[PDB]
Amino acid sequence: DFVGQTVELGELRLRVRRVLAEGGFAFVYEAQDVGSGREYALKRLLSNEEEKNRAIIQEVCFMKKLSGHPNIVQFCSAASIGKEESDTGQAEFLLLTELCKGQLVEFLKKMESRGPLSCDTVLKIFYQTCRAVQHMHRQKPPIIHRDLKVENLLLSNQGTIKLCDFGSATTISHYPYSNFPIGEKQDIWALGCILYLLCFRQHPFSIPPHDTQYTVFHSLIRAMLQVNPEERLSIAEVVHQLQEIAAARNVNPKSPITELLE
């Protein structure tokens, strides 16, 4: 019964309008600034263990560190409610972000009655996704997502892709001598599955033998789904290729995916 309440994240005071997603440890709600009228996403995570406290704070720290990027959900603020104050009796963490328009897959579902996605549309979706992941792998040390899938991509109000869900992400702490791989290449394998899925509307786990539509993406799919992680492309190898594909097709791949706006 969290819907209906009013909450305060510092300067901000705001009202809980409805549920957007339920799940395991967490729930997501639509929320409105009661003074300013501006709307927000609000994630509420429950903890009854110090272990969970650590995982939740880590997720908040990652969200904060990665904010500012056009393909990562914008962090607004965070807060906590102690076991003593909460309606659950557990500690509660509250994460405030910009509110996207909804889930990418819901918009694709609307359009898949209308035929396969054009290459330009695949290109925009996938580039914007890869640019979010590039922002993570460029951190020092790099941040590995570890849970990339097409279901946790959002579509912004501007019609762009927004990556969220940093609950599985990891990195190295107390980084002062190296650039060993530390997991980047698992994220790339996952991205290759997404490009495959967007083209052929099936999970890969073979590219169809006579496809003349998405042929432009075939070499990049195979190179991301390389079994040997050393052979497998880096995110910079992928993005560079996506940029040249876009230029050849006269597409600005950062632009709104207007077709998905209907």
């Binding site: 070499s219 990049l220 195979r222 190179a223 390389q226 050393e230 052979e231 492309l233 880096s234 910079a236 190898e237 993005v239 560079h240 290729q241």
Partner: protein, 120 residues
């Protein structure tokens, strides 16, 4: 280490072409060239990912240089066309872990001895 054997290059007229080749003593996943012009930084010029044939170029040579490889994946070739004074440099064959960082930073595992290219 892998041993790299380089040939081709030399002197040419502006607007002309030359070809470099580089043979490696074993398989490696990625091979390319970087160069160093008089007083300039090391500059990654071209790189090829062997299993996919994806090819990477700096903006300075895009549309003028073409890197390729043989079926045995032992050798790479660089065709340098529409050459100009800016392309005068020593060109070094190299292997790398990442073609994109190679073009951006000339980051390599191993580098060859180098071939002089002089335009005009």
């Amino acid at each position: 280490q892998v041993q790299l054997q380089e040939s081709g290059g030399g002197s040419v007229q502006a607007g002309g072409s030359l070809r470099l080749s580089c043979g490696a003593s074993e398989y490696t996943s990625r091979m390319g060239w970087f160069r160093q012009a008089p007083g300039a930084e090391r500059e990654g010029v071209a790189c090829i990912h062997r299993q996919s044939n994806l090819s990477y170029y700096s903006d300075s040579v895009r549309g003028r240089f073409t890197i390729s490889q043989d079926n045995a994946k032992t050798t790479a070739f660089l065709l340098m066309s529409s050459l100009k004074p800016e392309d005068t440099a020593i060109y070094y064959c190299a292997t790398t872990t990442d073609c994109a960082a190679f073009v951006e930073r000339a980051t390599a595992i191993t580098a060859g001895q180098g071939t002089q290219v002089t335009v005009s």
